[PDB]
Amino acid sequence: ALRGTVTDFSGFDGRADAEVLRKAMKGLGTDEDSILNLLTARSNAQRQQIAEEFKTLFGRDLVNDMKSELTGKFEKLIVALMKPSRLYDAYELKHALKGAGTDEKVLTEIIASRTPEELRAIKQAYEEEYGSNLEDDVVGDTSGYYQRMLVVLLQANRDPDTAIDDAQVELDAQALFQAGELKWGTDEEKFITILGTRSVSHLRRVFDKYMTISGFQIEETIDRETSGNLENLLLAVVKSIRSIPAYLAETLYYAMKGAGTDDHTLIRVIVSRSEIDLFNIRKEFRKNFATSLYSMIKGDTSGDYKKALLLLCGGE
Ligand SMILES: [Ca+2]
Ligand SMILES: [Ca+2]
Ligand SMILES: [Ca+2]
Ligand SMILES: [Ca+2]
Ligand SMILES: [Ca+2]
Ligand SMILES: [Ca+2]
Ligand SMILES: [Ca+2]
């Protein structure tokens, strides 16, 4: 089913690539284009082996040398590209959570779209890297039913997908209907429990059944019932339940639609998904916005940043 756009380079020689990169950085100036070109064509695992070889040949740290060399967006992109896969989401969440700053955009995006298996992996990689517990960090920086919905999701405890029980499907669509539209106010506790714990395939049936009973798609009710971060988060969760690729594709579209470019989100989703499902994300993107992702990136960005980004997307 899923497909990323970056694979392992056949005929990889770690040590040959470290020499290319030394040479691209040695002395006056920088050859961005050999870096760019070499690195968007190696898998993340291969980038780690290259970083190892560079260190045993030159006693130098590859990423440190690269960030003295490079600047701006392209620096940020090559650095994200060099982050170990198993550490990148942990890193982005730690960086969303920190200082005064908490950036709900990133927290909502990662935690709503990662599977239980990935949230487990992420929670383990965060405490082992940052010496703080992820849940405790989120709680500390968030409030309300937004906070609670993130903790539910952080339990990575969604029900398995067994066979569908149609009475349960009816029972949950009716409960959501009584919790929001038939309610003066909203029973957010009900929404967080059903949306937060039920298996994915059962929620796909609930959403349709909800449509049938109410005449509304669940998104429309979420929008009528809730405001702010919690609205944002429940929308993100619902979208991810129907399709993580499609959700991420519209995260992308909106980063670079809104006049400027949310370079942070562009780098973050392209790099995070490049070996998971970025192919399928480009599919959902062509389907819904009637542009190729390539064409939209090619026009919203520039330089070596644009070149690297397009080599990572691929497409026609
Ligand atoms: Ca140099
Ligand atoms: Ca720099
Ligand atoms: Ca904070
Ligand atoms: Ca709190
Ligand atoms: Ca209501
Ligand atoms: Ca609203
Ligand atoms: Ca734009």
Ligand 5 center to 190 CA (angstroms): 12
What distance in Å separates the CA atoms of residue 112 and residue 248, rounded to the nearest whole number? 10
Region of 160 (left: φ > 0; alpha: ψ -120 to 50; beta: rest) is beta
Distances (CA, A) of 74 to 38, 67, 156, 308: 14, 10, 34, 8
Which ligand approaches the C-alpha of residue 233 most closely? 6
Judge whether 11-83 and 84-157 match in fold: yes
Cβ neighbours, 10 Å, residue 94: 16
| 165: three-class secondary structure by DSSP | coil
What distance in Å separates the CA atoms of residue 238 and residue 109, rounded to the nearest whole number? 12
Ligand 1 center to 60 CA (angstroms): 13
| Resolution at which this structure was determined, Å | 1.9
Ligand 1 center to 301 CA (angstroms): 24
What distance in Å separates the CA atoms of residue 316 and residue 306, rounded to the nearest whole number? 15
What distance in Å separates the CA atoms of residue 210 and residue 202, rounded to the nearest whole number? 12
Which ligand approaches the C-alpha of residue 219 most closely? 6
| 162: three-class secondary structure by DSSP | coil
HSE-CB at 310 with a 13 A cutoff on CA atoms is: 16
Ligand 3 center to 290 CA (angstroms): 38
Ligand 3 center to 97 CA (angstroms): 4
Which ligand approaches the C-alpha of residue 145 most closely? 4
With CA atoms as reference, report the closest residue to 30 among 74, 82, 70: 70
What distance in Å separates the CA atoms of residue 143 and residue 146, rounded to the nearest whole number? 6
CATH architecture of 11-83: Orthogonal Bundle (1.10)
Using only C-alpha atoms, the chain has a radius of gyration, in whole angstroms, of: 22
Six token digits for residue 209: 């059944």
Ligand 3 center to 94 CA (angstroms): 9
Per-chain residues with Cβ under 5 A from ion ligand 6: 223, 227, 231
179 contacts 195 by C-beta, under 8 angstroms: no
Ligand 1 center to 36 CA (angstroms): 15
What distance in Å separates the CA atoms of residue 306 and residue 297, rounded to the nearest whole number? 7
Ligand 6 center to 188 CA (angstroms): 13
What is the longest distance spanned by two Cα atoms in the chain? 71
92 contacts 104 by C-beta, under 8 angstroms: no
DSSP single-letter state for residue 259? S
Residues 6 or more apart whose Cβ sits within 8 Å of residue 78: 35, 36, 39, 66, 70, 308
Six token digits for residue 263: 């370079």
Which ligand approaches the C-alpha of residue 260 most closely? 7
Distances (CA, A) of 166 to 163, 173, 177: 9, 11, 17
Distances (CA, A) of 288 to 174, 207, 250, 292: 30, 20, 8, 10
What distance in Å separates the CA atoms of residue 69 and residue 37, rounded to the nearest whole number? 16
What distance in Å separates the CA atoms of residue 234 and residue 219, rounded to the nearest whole number? 8
Which ligand approaches the C-alpha of residue 93 most closely? 3
What distance in Å separates the CA atoms of residue 227 and residue 105, rounded to the nearest whole number? 15
Which ligand approaches the C-alpha of residue 181 most closely? 5
Six token digits for residue 305: 């940043």
Ligand 5 center to 182 CA (angstroms): 6
What distance in Å separates the CA atoms of residue 274 and residue 254, rounded to the nearest whole number? 19
The fold of the 244-315 domain, in CATH, is Annexin V; domain 1 (1.10.220)
Distances (CA, A) of 237 to 152, 211, 234, 283, 305: 12, 17, 5, 20, 31
What distance in Å separates the CA atoms of residue 316 and residue 303, rounded to the nearest whole number? 19
What distance in Å separates the CA atoms of residue 158 and residue 42, rounded to the nearest whole number? 34
Is the domain defined by 158-243 classed in CATH 1.10.3720.10?
Answer: no
Domain ranges of the chain: 11-83, 84-157, 158-243, 244-315
238 contacts 219 by C-beta, under 8 angstroms: yes
Which ligand approaches the C-alpha of residue 231 most closely? 6
Ligand 4 center to 144 CA (angstroms): 8
Which ligand approaches the C-alpha of residue 224 most closely? 6
Which ligand approaches the C-alpha of residue 137 most closely? 3
Homologous superfamily assigned to 84-157: Annexin (1.10.220.10)
DSSP single-letter state for residue 299? H
Ligand 6 center to 216 CA (angstroms): 14
